[PDB]
Amino acid sequence: LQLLRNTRIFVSTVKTGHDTTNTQEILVQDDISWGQDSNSTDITVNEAGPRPTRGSKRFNDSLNAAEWSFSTYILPYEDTTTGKQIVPDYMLWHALSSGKAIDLDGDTGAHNNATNFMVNFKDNAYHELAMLHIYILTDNAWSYIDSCQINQAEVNVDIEDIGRVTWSGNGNQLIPLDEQPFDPDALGIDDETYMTIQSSYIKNKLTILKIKDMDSDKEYDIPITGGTFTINNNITYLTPNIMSRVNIPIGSFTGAFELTGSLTAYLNDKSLGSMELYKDLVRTLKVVNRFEIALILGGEYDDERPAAVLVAKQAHVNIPTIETDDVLGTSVEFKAIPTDLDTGDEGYLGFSNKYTKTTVANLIATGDGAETPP
Amino acid sequence: LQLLRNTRIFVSTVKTGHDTTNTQEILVQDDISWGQDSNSTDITVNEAGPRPTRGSKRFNDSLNAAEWSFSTYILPYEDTTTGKQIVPDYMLWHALSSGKAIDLDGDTGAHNNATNFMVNFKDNAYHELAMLHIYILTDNAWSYIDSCQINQAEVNVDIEDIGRVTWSGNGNQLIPLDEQPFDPDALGIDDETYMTIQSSYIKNKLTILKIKDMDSDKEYDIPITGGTFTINNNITYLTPNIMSRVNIPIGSFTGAFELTGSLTAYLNDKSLGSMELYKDLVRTLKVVNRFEIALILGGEYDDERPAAVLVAKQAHVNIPTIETDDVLGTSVEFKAIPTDLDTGDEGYLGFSNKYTKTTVANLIATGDGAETPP
Amino acid sequence: LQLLRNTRIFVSTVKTGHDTTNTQEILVQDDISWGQDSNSTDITVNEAGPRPTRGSKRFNDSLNAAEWSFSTYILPYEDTTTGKQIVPDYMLWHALSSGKAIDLDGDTGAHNNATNFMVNFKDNAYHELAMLHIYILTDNAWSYIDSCQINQAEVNVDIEDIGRVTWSGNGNQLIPLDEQPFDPDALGIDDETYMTIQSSYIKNKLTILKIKDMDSDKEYDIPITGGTFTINNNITYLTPNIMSRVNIPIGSFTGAFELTGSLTAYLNDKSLGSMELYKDLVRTLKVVNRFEIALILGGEYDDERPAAVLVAKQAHVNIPTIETDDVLGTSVEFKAIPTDLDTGDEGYLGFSNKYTKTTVANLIATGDGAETPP
Amino acid sequence: LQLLRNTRIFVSTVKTGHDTTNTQEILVQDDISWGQDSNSTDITVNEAGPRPTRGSKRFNDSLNAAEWSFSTYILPYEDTTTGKQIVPDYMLWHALSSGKAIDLDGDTGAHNNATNFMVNFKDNAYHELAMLHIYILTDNAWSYIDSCQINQAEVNVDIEDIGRVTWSGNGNQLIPLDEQPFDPDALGIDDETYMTIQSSYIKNKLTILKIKDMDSDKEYDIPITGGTFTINNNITYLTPNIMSRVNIPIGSFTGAFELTGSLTAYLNDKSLGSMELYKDLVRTLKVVNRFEIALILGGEYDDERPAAVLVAKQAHVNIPTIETDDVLGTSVEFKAIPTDLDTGDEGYLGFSNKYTKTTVANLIATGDGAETPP
Amino acid sequence: LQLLRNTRIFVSTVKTGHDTTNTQEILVQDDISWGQDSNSTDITVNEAGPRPTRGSKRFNDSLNAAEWSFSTYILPYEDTTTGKQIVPDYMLWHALSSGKAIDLDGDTGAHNNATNFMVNFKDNAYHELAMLHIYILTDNAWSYIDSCQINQAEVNVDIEDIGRVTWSGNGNQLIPLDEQPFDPDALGIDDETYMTIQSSYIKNKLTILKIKDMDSDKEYDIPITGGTFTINNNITYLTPNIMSRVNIPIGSFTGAFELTGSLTAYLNDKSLGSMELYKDLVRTLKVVNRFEIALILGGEYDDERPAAVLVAKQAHVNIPTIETDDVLGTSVEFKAIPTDLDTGDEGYLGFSNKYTKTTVANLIATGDGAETPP
């Protein structure tokens, strides 16, 4: 009874009218997790007398926001309906992108064209976010998260493992369901889709890094040894306290979302190498420098190959550190910084199965490698 | 010199007149531990001048309460003298039971009859407790703990390991002894006793759980995957501070003693199963529910078999949690709650080598399975 | 003194009242083995000083479960008392079948009728098993195993050697006996029985295999080159650790028993041949397929002939492998899988001296080839 | 049906357009091997209750990389088309040489001229390698390995046996074929070729060794007793884990390829003999020495004779060992070391049917014995 | 060149002033072995980039302790100079006996008198041992081990083969020598010595065993089927790690030396036979029993005959085991145990060419069979 991965996961914008447009099934890894916790309070009495007592009574106070998390592979493929690049989980990317309706052609948040899929953060600064719903399925059992919201996404550029993304978020409540709400197989993925998928994996070790200085126009060639980057949202949940009858969270505040990254490499002695960058950074000692950072997951080729691209137009670089690893490991940490307070952040995320270096240049320049850049 | 387990342990009510009635030897496991610590204080001076100095002098301040702990197996057997069930370590059970004299027939605290041994907490709420003495013996060496008091007892219902109990407590001081105080072998256990013992072990995996709702009279069948329960006392030690000549603890306060427990199981889809209980608990959301909990260590049979029983007449159940184990592990936590402030707690602990299911029903109903229950 | 095979073996349900009903002598092969081992622990001291020392003292800790094993031929014959097929060693088959009393007519576990002998696993899932006793006899000497339990049985379908079974198990202790406990010859086999036996051997090379697909209703004809199958129980022994006076095992846990098998053949190019099965299995790549497997040890005939039958109603087949043997050897591995968690496994084992193909069909269909199948 | 060596082996760069230029048949020895394996996972449940259960279900997880291996003789002969030395299996030598297109005249990787055939490792450091295809043929049956890559090559310089090479590699999958893909005889070898071949065998026992010190310019004469050398690649295969529907390897990483060797001899007392080398090596104790090593398989002559040559320009020699063989056997182990991290390794491998000592000197000096060395 | 056994072996206390008193030649068997090994470490780099590399450089790290071992026959004979029994290899026996100077009359370690040669372990517990030197000689070549120390000695009491001892040890370094250091023939054995030797061999099959119980004063007669015993030292070598210039061992720690033994026999049914001992040992189950064990290699006679004696005054016997050999083989294992931590071990080893049973009794009683025992 109740085998582990017989669970299946669906995400929906609304709780009724499920179809291939408002609902989507997503592939999941092994370590999927979800749960819901409650607060407790112990009260006891202490007395100075001849006949000491105990009596103590704890009471349930309230419910914490239900937690959920999983991981999935990066997976671009062409939709036969529109002839455009798309990923199975693009609903959640839109949810993280903005708190308004889906429009994959309006260029805001998440969008696509015949060549590639792009994600930006132009219209995300809200007090709330696009409210979604997560449905979990087991053998003859259903459950779902009410009013789930995404909080944190992380990507680890490993040297050996396949590229993946890890997602975590919270919701108001976890509730089981009495019956089957919608078709488990009609709205799911299909065999020919997965046949196209089997060629869309990212060959992780080919990932390449590019750096450019915004002060002296200097550039460096930096071989790398893996790293990470992370987008956060700092969600918070509000809760009134009528503890005489238990309380439930009523809403959420979207704090300041964040984008950070970290890189590792060897200290290399070469022209415009890691040694030169390290010396420049040490001698600089400026309060605020500016740099442009490009990560090409899967590498790049003159031909059409699968790849993903992370772009930072204004990232400020911290002072690097040297470790005692076997061969002189070096580490660098960087943050996203928008130009002035209210303007857009780095934003540009790109994914496709057919990037070429020329298209990569356009994608870096404008956030879209398809059309002619200025 | 000084082989490890050549240590032997005795417990006595008084320091003189040792015999089989006021002293008892108990079997011990490998990980027995004991020790005594002291406090220290460092004083130093800092000066703003041309000739900086150091001088610093630490002083011994006081002694902390000596700590001791060990573990032993649950072990019921019939005493040939009285024809009643008894355990070798029933002195310490009485000590935890009440702060007054031993009476195994007064039904208060610890008692027994021809069928089984029972322990209750009717008369334990004191500012102190029954003061005992622990003697430790090594090859040609003796030591003892002055005014030891029990604090914490824990029982782990494991799926595979034999049932055991772990005991920890404190005392005023640890003092070595110059000579042999009392006979090491005359007051110890004997061979025929241990021959009877070898059949008194508890076959742990047979342990069974029963739950009953006090609101809707509902009951559930819950297969389990091990768990724990714990009794605490929250002892505290008082100490005046004449640090010009070192200090020693002078007495103890018995805080609020406690009884808690935790259980684990699989999410099972069956009538009155774990799924039904989980749904009821989630939908309930009441501040204070009430339940009756029965643990039968060793299981039960219509025939006479060795077993132990833990009874909770009023335990309140917390909201259960679901883990990401290989097959949908679920966890439940519960506490003992007395009816109103000053009345007796759950209390009922039962042990014997010959429980039957009919006797188990009476034991659950009244705390004694021998006589006719109402 | 003490010639080797002058040993004789008896098995009994109880230690007293030995007769032809509760005790049975079984034929044994040459390689019979039995023994009992003990654990040891070495303690030593290391010191940093000018006068280094040695002293080290090992102590006996406990006894491991006594091991025993042997082998015997498959041997069906008709009992003149009941007019039903029976095997000399059917006590141990019942012991492996269930942990309750013998009933060769209740159809549970092991049973028989006027035509054949059957064994099933309907009522075997216990924490323990039917506790038996093994007596070994040598010239003027007796010994016995206390509380022996069967663990593992293996059958090797060889191309040339006679069919045989190999049995291994464990017990609490091995104990010699001071005198002759029961008649060595009155309860043993008799000459006329063995005269009937001499015709009951299995002509091993005639063994045949049948396979049926549960998805496409497909069947194949597979000539074979020998193989094996094995039933396991994963017994475990529990032992408290009072090492100051040596310990002895007190009980056993029956783990998950198991049924597995392996087959070998040549890659044959024929309609519904091994090549076709190999291609189907390679192209399938399904997570869980289902198949029905029939082994007929001794082959089958339209006439009455001696044979044994192994039936797997739901066996899942692993991906076969190809070896570099002289002519393209191929290997297949399979496991027993019950329908859902708690239901009965494959179970059906059949033995007789007079199987016919029509009776074989009924035996495959229902587990009993005597009565009319549905 | 299906006789053993009626198998024939072909290697192709592409799956279509088979001819004498993109496909080649190679001679094989007896012990050719190939296979493909799959992973399995067993899940079971353990419960503490009165009605213990079993149910366990294994699931197929994924496929391991298909393994293949064989051996063949070293075989140089002159091609009538180009008038240059060539070996039948030079496709696989090119595959091991580099991951780019064939060019037997560009001097990179594998090349040749009118005198001899050479192999180098100048352009092999890639993340992948030249992807080839292996076709295996049996009587009325075809199979092939998809995306096979070479991993390991070994050569054993035996005293008595003919020189041979052993090759092992892996591929994505093993797939049978429904029909005959290409002509089995038109693209194979021809009779006159084999008539030329019968004179191209290497008389193994004539193999000679030369050693030169790079520190003191010292040289030694070392009679040898056989040995080995090995080239490795440390290939690795990547595999996503969607185990709800089985997985297949998607790509490979080329690790660090390697070249090592080992030699054996007698301890000989002579000027510049093995004794002198042993004494020098023992007294040296330097961290990194440098040596030049030459192996001439088949020996050398002033006349034109068949031979092969292994050259190590920078090999570092480990400390030799002495064995207890009948006459004072001694063993030496050596590794290839490039000058600095990124430069070319030893590389130089030479093969021909007409080496002369003067040509051997040029081959040692430059890696090509045909043109005038500097 | 360099014939195998033309090697000769000498042992010396010091490296200069070689004579018949500080140097001795010993007979050796065929399988003599010696060698010296070194450690290696491989370092490699892995990079995630477009132009992957290899470069790897191993470095020599340090030298392990040189190993050496051989075997020789037990060989007592009378020295004409002192008129006392002596063995050719008594230097190494003294070395194993103690770490101080030789004194064959001080009764400590190794000593002798006019009747026999004795070895004890009274003064051996040191951090080091008597440092010796081993010289190996071949045709026109010399080598030696620097600071060799004995570690392990083994004796196999075989039924058919002549008695022998096997010795193994380690040293700091193995170094060849440029010239002849000392006379190879003047310090060696002489012809008349070997003429006396030819009568000093031990007729192995006559070896006898005696056992006595230290609890009930019981004794048994045990015919035996061979066995072994072993003395160990657990030497360890220390080594600093300056790997930038290679390291060499600088010293050794003598761990806990050890004495163990194992015996085999048939299960014999006789008064005080092996059956009785087996029953007593099985029923005993005591943690620590005590026994006295006597091995007489070569047997004993009322007349003067060559023999050796091993004495264990306090050996503790493990639980014996029964094997499936052709006739009921039984095995027993025993260890040496000193009385309390720091006192002397069994120690008593005796050798002579003229033991008599009466002298054997005295040797067992006191460790010396010559003088009058108490």
Residue numbers in the entry:
A (entry chain D), B (entry chain D), C (entry chain D), D (entry chain D), E (entry chain D): 3 to 376
Which text from the study accompanies this structure?
We present a composite map determined by electron cryo-microscopy (cryo-EM) at resolutions ranging between 2.9 Å to 4.9 Å of the entire T5-like phage particle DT57C, and atomic models comprising its core structural proteins. Our results provide a complete atomic structure of a T5-like phage, provide insights into the process of DNA ejection as well as a structural basis for the design of engineered phages and future mechanistic studies.
Thus, the overall TMP organization within the tail tube of the phage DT57C can be described as a three-stranded parallel coiled coil, with α-helical secondary structure at least at its N- and C-termini (in accordance with secondary structure prediction).
